[PDB]
Symmetry: D2
Subunit: 78 residues, 4 copies
């Protein structure tokens, strides 16, 4: 006649399902957060590569202008 | 002149300042993303603890009702 | 004449490349951290899906055994 | 009596505890991953601040050496 074990066991099964649903929603939101992290890191990496190349380009520009000045200096009285 | 080396060098310094501002804005957005990540993990950990306790509680309920039934059975004719 | 502006400007250009190199190494390490994060979330999502299905399976098992008991009860004297 | 409903229900309660233990281990590993992520972002933010200050410092050196040159040019024949 007593259904206390069954009632308590049924409630827990119901709560287990509720928790699995909430965990899925949390995990779906975490997938969008992981996409934001990737995008953010990608933009930063693009910025870093670009600037590293821009520093090298300026180094070469000045090296070319110096070489040009050495060519000019050879025409001076010495 | 000639101001070519100086112009190229000034341009790079300018570009670097502009890029440091954009990197800071990307890093500010990434700190909010870190916060969403921590929060998500915390919610999942809370869910885990809660369910672990809920299972243990039902196991205890079951052991208590079983013990109670053994005491009830001691009143039966044997 | 005096080369103080050029020395200071050369030093900064050198530091800019040093920093771009270190930022790249930090970003490469962050790519492996984003991979560990995806993997962790995937394992959790797999666990959540599996358990959600396991709860539904038990619910159906119980439902079938309850239906079987109704059929058994129909054979009792009434 | 038949104990099939109870065996199936007991098995689910058992599996849930086992899975909660594995989820906790995954979440503990994800806490270290979140720490590596924070650390990486802080190092990048420190790099950004440092370089921004280094560029500003060179800009000020340049302006000071230019002011100094204006003062010494005032001593030239005009
Ligand atoms: Cl009865
Ligand atoms: Cl259960
Ligand atoms: Cl420079
Ligand atoms: Cl007894
Ligand atoms: Cl009937
Ligand atoms: Cl003057």
């Amino acid at each position: 006649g007593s259904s206390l074990i069954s009632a308590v066991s049924d409630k827990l099964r119901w709560r287990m399902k509720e928790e699995m649903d909430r965990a899925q929603a949390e995990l779906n939101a975490l997938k969008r957060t992981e996409e934001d992290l990737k995008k953010g890191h990608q933009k930063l990496e693009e910025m870093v590569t670009r600037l590293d190349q821009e520093v090298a380009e300026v180094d070469k520009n000045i090296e070319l202008l110096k070489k040009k000045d050495e060519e000019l200096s050879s025409a001076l009285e010495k």
